[PDB]
Ligand binder design. Sequence first.
Ligand SMILES: COc1cc(COc2ccc(S(=O)(=O)O)c3ccccc23)cc(OC)c1
Ligand SMILES: COc1cc(COc2ccc(S(=O)(=O)O)c3ccccc23)cc(OC)c1
Ligand SMILES: [Ca+2]
Ligand SMILES: [Ca+2]
Lengths: 204, 204
Amino acid sequence: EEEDAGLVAEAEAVAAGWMLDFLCLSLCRAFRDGRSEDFRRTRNSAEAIIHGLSSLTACQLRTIYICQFLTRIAAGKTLDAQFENDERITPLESALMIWGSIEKEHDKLHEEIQNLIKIQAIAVCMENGNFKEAEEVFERIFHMPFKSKLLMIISQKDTFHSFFQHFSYNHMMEKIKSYVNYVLSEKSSTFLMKAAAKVVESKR
Amino acid sequence: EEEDAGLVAEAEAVAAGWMLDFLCLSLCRAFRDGRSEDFRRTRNSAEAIIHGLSSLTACQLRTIYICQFLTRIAAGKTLDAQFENDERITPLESALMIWGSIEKEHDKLHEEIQNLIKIQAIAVCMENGNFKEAEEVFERIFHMPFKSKLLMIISQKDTFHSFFQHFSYNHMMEKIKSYVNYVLSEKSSTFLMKAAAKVVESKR
Ligand SMILES: COc1cc(COc2ccc(S(=O)(=O)O)c3ccccc23)cc(OC)c1
Ligand SMILES: COc1cc(COc2ccc(S(=O)(=O)O)c3ccccc23)cc(OC)c1
Ligand SMILES: [Ca+2]
Ligand SMILES: [Ca+2]
């Protein structure tokens, strides 16, 4: 009669999976809408739920990587945040590692977001006056003409450069929001959200 | 067309309610089984989910109070834990306040658990050698003959007293576990657990 505790542990693993998918959808939607405090509170919930899980499918792992990517991007201007065991890695550099690791299609939007994160990883350093740090970020990350324009900007110490204006933080955020909209379309059919939406719809 | 964001916020509130009921059931079951680390990880999850909730029904509030009560009881021997804004209140004193506030039937088991928490609030102090603290705990909490036996034990500084053995920490834990078993029976029918159990049962 010890099988009952096994069947309970299995059911809690099924419920945690549904809770994880739901909290990713909620986290993605909060990032898209600019709801900063809801993103902060939902990220805390997703991390806690994840610590209570032992087995993860490939889809659940991809889902977690997307949440980690959005968390780092949000923290992109927070140079005091240490997301990696190596304490020199800045938040935008950390988001770049995850963006190159996710098992996803490498379409034009993928490469545009990647290139925007690389320009901004340097620019944010420039903006805070950490010129030597921008040079170090440049070396860890690094097209050949694209590469030489950035090195010229770091050496010239011109933090407020027109190149950065052209491929702005806002530009990087809007492109990332377009991608999040495709993830939101894919996850809107998860079990928790679907059953919650039906309850709301039945009271209308 | 701003109604869609309202319907989303409503559905997330419905899903959070189901997640809360599920995490209480999981937390109660972990306490009953002696699964200390699962209790610790599930408590973290319940607190996070609760911070993402604005409206609470009376049932949800009762449910949260039971989780807070079990958390304090588990931490009953941790005299370094400060659960209240008043820093002098010990964990067992804090569990006593919640046990007297929950809207529940005051049956014989209720009063037995209450009386066991009062004896142990003092005993744990005694056991660590904080005699003046046990006297202070005694004054904040305090039957007339029952009251005088305890004061005699604090004054005599006899930490290893036979009275404490008779109404032991283990005794208090077992009685609290009987109560938790009735809560587990009531909550086993919540939506998340019920739908998770069906999925596990359909794969058998
Ligand atoms: C492979 O995924 C994980 C996830 C965790 C715990 O979940 C998280 C940890 C850290 C972050 S953050 O990006 O650093 O803020 C998360 C962000 C969003 C969602 C979950 C996060 C742990 C783990 O290994 C210990 C692996
Ligand atoms: C009325 O219930 C709440 C709950 C919270 C947040 O949830 C929790 C806070 C603290 C504890 S603990 O007992 O101190 O560890 C919890 C334990 C179990 C479950 C939830 C807990 C906050 C709140 O007001 C801010 C009111
Ligand atoms: Ca730094
Ligand atoms: Ca203390």
